[PDB]
Amino acid sequence: VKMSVKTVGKEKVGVLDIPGFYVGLTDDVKVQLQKLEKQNVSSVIIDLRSNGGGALTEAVSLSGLFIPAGPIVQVRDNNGKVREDSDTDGQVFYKGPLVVLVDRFSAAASEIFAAAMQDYGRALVVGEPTFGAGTVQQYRSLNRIYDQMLRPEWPALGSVQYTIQKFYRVNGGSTQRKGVTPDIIMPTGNEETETGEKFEDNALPWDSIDAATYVKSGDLTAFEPELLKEHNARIAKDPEFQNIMKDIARFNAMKDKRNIVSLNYAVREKENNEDDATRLARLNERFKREGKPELKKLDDLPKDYQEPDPYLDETVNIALDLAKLEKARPA
Amino acid sequence: TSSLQASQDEFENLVRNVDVKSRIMDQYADWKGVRYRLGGSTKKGIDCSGFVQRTFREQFGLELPRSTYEQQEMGKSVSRSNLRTGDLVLFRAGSTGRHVGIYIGNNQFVHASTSSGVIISSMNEPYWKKRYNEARRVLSRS
Amino acid sequence: SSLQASQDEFENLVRNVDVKSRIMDQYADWKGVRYRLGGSTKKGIDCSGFVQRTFREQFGLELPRSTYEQQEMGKSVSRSNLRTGDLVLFRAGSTGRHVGIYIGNNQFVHASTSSGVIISSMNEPYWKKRYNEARRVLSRSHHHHHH
Amino acid sequence: RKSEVLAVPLQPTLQQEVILARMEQILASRALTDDERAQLLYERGVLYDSLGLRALARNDFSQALAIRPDMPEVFNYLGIYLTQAGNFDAAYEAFDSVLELDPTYNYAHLNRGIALYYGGRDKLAQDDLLAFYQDDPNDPFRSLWLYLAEQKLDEKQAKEVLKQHFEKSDKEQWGWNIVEFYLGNISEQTLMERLKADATDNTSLAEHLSETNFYLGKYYLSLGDLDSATALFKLAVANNVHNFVEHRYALLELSLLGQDQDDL
Amino acid sequence: RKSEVLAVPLQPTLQQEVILARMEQILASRALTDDERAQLLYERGVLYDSLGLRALARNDFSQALAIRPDMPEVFNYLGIYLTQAGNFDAAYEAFDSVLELDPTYNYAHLNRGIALYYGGRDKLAQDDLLAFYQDDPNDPFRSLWLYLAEQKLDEKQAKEVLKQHFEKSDKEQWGWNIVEFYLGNISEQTLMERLKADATDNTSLAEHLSETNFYLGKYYLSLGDLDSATALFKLAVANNVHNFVEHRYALLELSLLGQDQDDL
């Protein structure tokens, strides 16, 4: 719940780590993203990695901070009535440019959040194409009012969660099958992952209702060449992005014969030593690059935290160049 | 699609809040024309904040603080498009910095102004329309 | 909305107020105020502004500002059947139109250019000569209209 | 013998029921003065009347009178209910009380006129309705009721007076079209088409249909066409606008037709 | 485009109003147990429903439930009101509660079927309405509702099942004449004449006209004649029998037609 909005570094560029769209996530994040409206704003980032969707009203109350009173999500039942949900209480409190970083294992409410910012053009979409959930469920208790009176010996009864509505973006499209294609593609996302909504059983089809009414801030969603080639330079100018591309090439090579694995202890020990030697080589390369002493044996180093995320560093670089543009693009 | 359309909860809410305007108007009828006096809480002379406090305490039982500044942080903020009777309307008067009134519907608010004392005024009046600030809801009961 | 309409109708039904007494309260609070064109304050007031402020602060009817706009409000009424609380329109003044509030017994309170806001008699020669129309805006009770 | 316009019969609005519930709650409580008690009783009686609950309305009115005996509006509603019940002398007395407590309550004149008209005192009814017409001559329904009164005296004279009233009016209010049909100036089809044109929502359509069907029933009854009169009166009362004098007295005319049918 | 029978729209009876007044008086008093209070609340809600005051009826029912939560009849009325309001899922749940507290309340099936019928779950509606038909096959309106359900599945099959039901009945209750018209066996004129014949007083005429006009409106609606359907539904609701399912769902059909007209 830490609120330390200070101008340190080059700009007030921060990363917001969301574990889940909690019912109290707005009530605890309003301490974080509210008090900077009159003062100077900056290019901050919102990270929706490994996110779980909790509530839709909270998703709309949290997404109303960056959009001045606008429809966040459209809902459609089996009959055909469309309703646009937006909390009509509060203007855009955080008037700063924003970058959203999202992974492929993200929540559906996080998809709603990112889709709202992408269709409004106010934020920048960075990361991996999301899971692709487009269904709204209702969570209801199975208790009647007469249960307590005439069945006192019963225990507590279960609950149910059934899809009542289907949600859509204000641009008219949906994320039930196609997901969201971000402006800034990541290397780990370029692989054809065998996970998502398609590989789920009985997944609903895709349908695009007509586009909602919304004010778009510049058509930079389809045209992002400014930062695109800059970050391609940045990923081709560092060996970490290259080693990760080698990892994904190993994935693309192993996935041919992934279903049937062969267990020969000789070749298995061979591949185990190969992986240990490759990890030791990459660790010595990054130590030489960073100036830290090299590791030689696995016993001195205990279990600790490895490198968190270079894609957050690329998002911080993106926010830096976005502040560069905003300094060079008021006209 | 007439009366049954409104749910049972909405029906109870309507029956429970249908007299809010009537209570505020009762307070106005008993209190209209009282002079304006800074830091006054009596019929000899009253200010906007004191009038709001006495009204919300005597008609509803809600004990709001005394200063306009404290009232401005009371309750929950509300937007101009969806404001109901019994909500607090805040203007940027500036004689003390802020001004408080009680919205009664149809761009109207009851308040103790420094010029003509406690009266009804219109939100569309040039002075108040130009000098509008925020709005707060304090009658939490629905 | 719905709550707004219901509360307004409830307030209308519950209030059994006395129009003459309320208008006289406004007069007592406003007697002797000087006349000023385009003035809406106790520093200086005009007939139209006085009528607007009176009908807004004592009842709740948001009438327009100009005498010309006010003259088209409500429904016209004849002199023989004139009730308290109706606005009486004269064809005099700086702009050709003048507004007062009838209070009974051929009397009306108004912001005249002579000695400011005062009560005057409908039977006075000046105003009897300079009468135009009269309209009622304080209605009684109309549910469904005959159309 | 003709196709007719139809509206959705009016249903009680949410406002009416919410207000009636709140009134039940408030009248249930003791903390209210007797003046406020009579005021709320009169308001609830008015609401009952608007909903067609006339016995409950008369009950609330009678209680408000037993609290405050100087309420002319309660006497007015009581006289209207006495007219509907057919006790015309009591209606005369109630309207006399109305004018005694307040002589500017002009609608009392109209109601007493209608009472006398259904009583058989056509001359006094003519007097009262003429006074009401003098109060506002451009209101077409005033001239219509005055004509209904005078028709019991001299038909030709009544039609000529109605034509003069129509000519001297501003002819701005829609009801005059009814008058025009009464004067042989527009076809019934043109009347119904102007009705369809002037109605905006279902409620205004119900109002138009109620009044127009009542006056058309009276017209076809004057010509001796009992069946058309009964059908038009039923179509009028079917609009469920229970506060209109046309609605009440259409029910009354249907009752009189049933009585005439019963007595051989 | 056809001549129609007309009844005097039903007016609240004196008995209803005296009962409602005494109920207000009794509920005003404190000397009442909670069981007796819930009973009186349910009865007063029933009276409000019979008078067309459905919001007040729902209020009294909800209060009686807040007192005693084991009242299946209150759930039945609440589900009916949810159907009328268009909240069909809640209606399903309320009728489920009805059958849970008492599985012998057979009419609940019918109501839930109607709900499902207006919801779009034609098969489940068919199941419920067929169960209700099994409870008493000679009731013509049960077969009528079953046909209304099955028509959304197979028109020919539904009409044949309706003809089979009619043949298998004793054909003693008057309603089968409607069924006969639905089977192309009697002219609409013959239907209306049999209606005139079977009605004794004004109230029976109003009942007949309500039911028949509702089913005829549904018929002309299935054939694509919107105007005739609207007119028949209005003529049904004009009978002021607020307790008939035909009345409620005629209002519902009028609401749905207005909805279809509004959105281009």
Residue numbers in the entry:
A (entry chain D): 345 to 675
B (entry chain I): 21 to 162
C (entry chain J): 22 to 168
D (entry chain A), E (entry chain B): 25 to 288
The authors write:
The protein level of MepS is known to be regulated by the periplasmic PDZ-protease Prc (or tsp, tail-specific protease) in complex with the adaptor NlpI42. The structure of NlpI in complex with MepS provides molecular insight into NlpI-interacting endopeptidase colocalization, while the Prc-NlpI-MepS complex elucidates the molecular mechanism of NlpI-mediated MepS degradation by the tail-specific protease Prc.
We also examined the stoichiometry of the PrcSK-mMepS-NlpI complex through simultaneous SAXS and UV–Vis absorption measurements. The results showed that two monomeric PrcSK molecules bind to heterohexameric NlpI-mMepS, forming a 2:2:4 hetero-octameric complex measured at the eluent peak, with a confidence level exceeding 90%. Although the side-chain orientations can be easily defined in both NlpI and mMepS, the density maps of Prc are quite poor, except for the residues 42–120 (the N-terminal of NHD), 208–244 (the vault region) and 479–520 (the partial platform domain). The NlpI-interaction domain comprising helix h1 (residues 42–56) and helix h14 (residues 488–494) of Prc involved in interacting with NlpI can be well defined and almost identical between the structures of PrcSK-NlpI-MepS and NlpI-Prc-K477A. Owing to the missing electron density of  the ligand-binding PDZ domain, neither the position of PDZ domain nor the distance between the C-terminus of mMepS and the PDZ domain can be clearly determined. Overall, this study advances our knowledge of how NlpI recruits multiple MepS molecules and reveals the essential structural details required to understand the mechanism of NlpI-enabled MepS colocalization.
